[PDB]
Amino acid sequence: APNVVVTRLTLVCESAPGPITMDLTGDLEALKKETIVLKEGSEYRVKIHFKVNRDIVSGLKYVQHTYRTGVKVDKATFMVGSYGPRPEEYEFLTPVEEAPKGMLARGTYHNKSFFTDDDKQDHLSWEWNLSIKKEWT
Ligand SMILES: N[C@H](c1ccc(-c2ccccc2)cc1)c1cccs1
Numbered sequence: 409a410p411n412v413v414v415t416r417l418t419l420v421c422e423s424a425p426g427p428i429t430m431d432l433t434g435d436l437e438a439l440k441k442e443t444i445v446l447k448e449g450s451e452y453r454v455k456i457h458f459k460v461n462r463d464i465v466s467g468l469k470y471v472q473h474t475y476r477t478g479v480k481v482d483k484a485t486f487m488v489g490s491y492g493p494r495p496e497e498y499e500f501l502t503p504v505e506e507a508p509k510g511m512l513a514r515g516t517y518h519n520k521s522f523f524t525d526d527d528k529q530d531h532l533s534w535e536w537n538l539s540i541k542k543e544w545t
Pocket of ligand 1: 418445446452454475476479480481482508517519538539
């Protein structure tokens with residue numbers, strides 16, 4: 409296995425009625441037709457789970473590009489940093505953001521995520537969709 413293995417994305421939202429997560433260890437192609445759901449206006453964090461198997465790694469970064477119809481791409485880069493090898497997964501969390509709000513803000517956002525580093529290595533790249541709704545259901 410590679411030294412760095414990205415295993416999971418979770419949306420951390422205390423107001424959500426259940427877990428919001430995606431296993432990143434398998435068929436990433438299937439994520440493109442799927443979606444995860446946030447109630448409009450919800451406060452959330454993106455949490456990336458990853459393993460460091462053998463060697464200290466440095467310069468890790470999480471890059472997230474969000475696409476919404478009629479809008480230019482919303483690009484955000486988050487410094488993840490340096491991690492040593494250990495059996496248990498690490499979790500990196502972004503700062504809190506607020507999900508969009510408004511009937512016209514609802515619906516699909518297409519995300520492209522990169523777990524990478526200062527040397528531009530592709531630890532994992534994946535697409536996933538977010539659906540913003542008036543209510544959780
Ligand atoms: N600002 C919005 C935006 C909407 C949703 C998210 C998002 C991403 C991942 C998880 C939860 C929410 C980020 C930004 C825009 C995106 C593109 C054009 S406008």
